[PDB]
């Protein structure tokens, strides 16, 4: 049980991505160090959002982690984030919708900092008045094509950027009802989604946009003055500042009279559930960072976009680019922090690419994506039921015909085939699963996949490493939805598994 030892208990350790204003954050940390005597260390490790589950599962890692709120759902699932109950006088200082972004299972698990949303960015010299509607963009592109320019270029390869148009007329990921997501209700292939994606493919068919345009092509074309408009977030502003392009930022165009609905990421600060410095961390976030002066120091280094603190958001909003960022956020929806979201994104990414290349119609592309998103939700329930059953066999409490049939097949596999740390569990999981499906996928090796994951979850409880159980559940859910689902659908689905193994 050597993992119980700790590192750097005398300093407040902070993890924040390198593209954020960490030097401005460090400046806030220096003021905190002077007033308290406790040294603040701001680190920006590469891939810190993937390292945090490993280090935090043994009571280690940073005292505070900064990241978009949607990734904090998985952290709160494993119990890696401390539950905060800030005073009402402090909660009233931030916008209510930002607190909703940091609430998991009815508990606040982070402090919201900044509000990031996509906006319409336009070249003021090519287009002094940007269009209010998507519908007028084809006619606008005609005029600019005569002058050797184009109307709009943005990243078509990632559904984060195309979803605002797809959602405008009625598309949705998971129905959101009073702080909860109905994972059985997916709006990927409804009438509104089809209308938005059809408008997008029509732009490509009418040569107003190209299907190969990605982030790098769109950013380079805009920043050199070749296209009049782009769709992007505050993270892209710095590169346009140093270019010769004089750009504005405004509300996204409407589709069929309805607002574009981008998904909103809320930069948030979570406190490590096992940090010995939780009170110091809460003191730093509430009394130093989340003030006008603290947010200004970070925003001056790298623009935060809109902020959760009302007093400083009203000051920032005097610049139309910030008022536009907030306005598109208000017209959009907070990014769901549920784990069924990553499979939604994989499904819609394939659908948009296939529809834009002409390999599928809009109807078939979205129908595939609708089924994939829903089936990936059922796959997670299969994982969670399997692990709960495997832990209940050894008397461990932890948070229809397919479940029963897979249980018995797994018990049969352990009959015929009768140290652990978060770092070693990840390595062995990647090693065994790779060896299982290197020469193909079949039902027998899927059953071996569930049994291997179940047994490893049991050993995690034995080593007093409960958060690793939820880490493993996520790894299994990811691999099943990314590398095994296509084979399952093409081989008859889980019903074919029951018909081969069930009575």
From Swiss-Prot:
Part of the ABC transporter complex MalEFGK involved in maltose/maltodextrin import. Binds maltose and higher maltodextrins such as maltotriose. The lineage of its organism: Bacteria, Pseudomonadati, Pseudomonadota, Gammaproteobacteria, Enterobacterales. The keyword Transmembrane helix does not apply. Induction: Induced by maltose and the transcriptional regulator MalT. Permanently repressed by cold shock in a PNPase-dependent fashion. It is found in: Periplasm. This is Maltose/maltodextrin-binding periplasmic protein. InterPro entries: Maltose/Cyclodextrin-bd, SBP, SBP_1_CS. One of its GO terms (biological process) is maltodextrin transmembrane transport. Belongs to the bacterial solute-binding protein 1 family. It comes from the Bacteria. Keywords: Periplasm, Signal, Sugar transport, Transport.
């Amino acid at each position: 049980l050597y993992f119980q030892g700790k590192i750097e208990e005398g300093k407040l350790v902070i993890w924040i991505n390198g593209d954020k204003g960490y030097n401005g954050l460090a400046e806030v940390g220096k003021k905190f160090e002077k007033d308290t005597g406790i040294k603040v260390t701001v680190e920006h490790p590469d891939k810190l959002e993937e390292k945090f589950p490993q280090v935090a599962a043994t009571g280690d890692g940073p005292d505070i982690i900064f990241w978009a709120h949607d990734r904090f759902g998985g952290y709160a699932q494993s119990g890696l984030l401390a539950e905060i109950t800030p005073a009402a006088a402090f909660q009233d200082k931030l916008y209510p919708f930002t607190w909703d972004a940091v609430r998991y299972n009815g508990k606040l698990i982070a402090y919201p900092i900044a509000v990031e949303a996509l906006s319409l960015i336009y070249n003021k010299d090519l287009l002094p008045n940007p269009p209010k509607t998507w519908e007028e963009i084809p006619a606008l592109d005609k005029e600019l094509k005569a002058k050797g320019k184009s109307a709009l270029m943005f990243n078509l390869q990632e559904p984060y950027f195309t979803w605002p148009l797809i959602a405008a007329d009625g598309g949705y990921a998971f129905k959101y009802a009073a702080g909860k997501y109905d994972i059985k209700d997916v709006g990927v292939d409804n009438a509104g989604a089809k209308a938005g994606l059809t408008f997008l493919v029509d732009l490509i068919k009418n040569k107003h946009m190209n299907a190969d345009t990605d982030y790098s092509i769109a950013e380079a074309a805009f920043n050199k003055g070749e296209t009049a408009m782009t769709i992007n977030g505050p993270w892209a502003w710095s590169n346009i500042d140093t270019s010769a392009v004089n750009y504005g930022v405004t509300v996204l165009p409407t589709f069929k009279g309805q607002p574009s609905k981008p998904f909103v990421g809320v930069l948030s600060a979570g406190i490590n559930a096992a940090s010995p410095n939780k009170e110091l961390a809460k003191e730093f976030l509430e009394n130093y960072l989340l003030t006008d002066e603290g947010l200004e120091a970070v925003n001056k280094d790298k623009p935060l976009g809109a902020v959760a603190l009302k007093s400083y958001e009203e000051e920032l909003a005097k610049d139309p680019r910030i008022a536009a960022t907030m306005e598109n956020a208000q017209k959009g929806e907070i990014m769901p922090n549920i784990p069924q979201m990553s499979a939604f994104w994989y499904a819609v990414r394939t659908a948009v690419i296939n529809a834009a290349s002409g390999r599928q119609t809009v109807d078939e592309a979205l129908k595939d994506a609708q089924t994939a998103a829903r089936a990936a939700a059922d796959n997670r329930e299969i994982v969670m039921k399997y692990i709960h059953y495997k832990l209940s066999q050894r008397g461990y409490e932890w948070d229809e015909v397919v479940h029963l049939t897979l249980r018995q097949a797994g018990d049969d596999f352990s009959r015929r085939y009768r140290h652990l740390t978060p770092f070693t569990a990840r390595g062995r999981f990647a090693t065994v699963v790779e060896e299982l499906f290197r020469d193909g996928v079949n039902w027998g090796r899927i059953v071996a996949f569930f049994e291997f994951g179940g047994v490893m979850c049991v050993e995690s409880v034995n080593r007093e490493m409960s958060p690793l159980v939820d880490n493993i559940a996520l790894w299994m859910t990811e691999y099943l939805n990314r590398h095994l689902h296509t084979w399952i659908q093409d081989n008859g689905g889980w019903d074919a598994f029951v018909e081969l193994y069930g009575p």
